[PDB]
Amino acid sequence: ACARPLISVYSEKGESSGKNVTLPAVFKAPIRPDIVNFVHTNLRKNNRQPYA
């Protein structure tokens, strides 16, 4: 969607400080689990060592 709320920046004490920032649109980008799984499958193969 286009509605982006504001997220507060929490202090080291666990309680909210006065600062707050707008939600970046990346969190509003579409979620595609099928292609996330596809990309993960095809990229997890690049760290394999050979054997024979």
Partner 1 sequence: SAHLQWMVVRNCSSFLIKRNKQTYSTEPNNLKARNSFRYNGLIHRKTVGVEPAADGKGVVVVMKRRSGQRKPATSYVRTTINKNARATLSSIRHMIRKNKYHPDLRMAAIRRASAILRSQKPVM
Binding residues for partner 1, per CB under 8 A? 5, 31, 33
The one-letter amino acid at 22: T
- Which of the choices partner 1, RNA, none does residue 43 contact, using the CB cut-off of 5 to 8 A by kind? RNA
Instruction: Tokens for 50, please give them.
Output: 């050979």
Instruction: Quote the DSSP letter at residue 29.
Output: S
- Which of the choices RNA, partner 1, none does residue 19 contact, using the CB cut-off of 5 to 8 A by kind? none
Q: What is the CA radius of gyration of the chain?
A: 19
Size of the site for RNA (CB under 7 A): 18
The one-letter amino acid at 8: S
- Binding region for RNA (CB under 7 A): 1-6, 22, 25, 28, 30, 32, 34-35, 38, 43, 46-47, 49
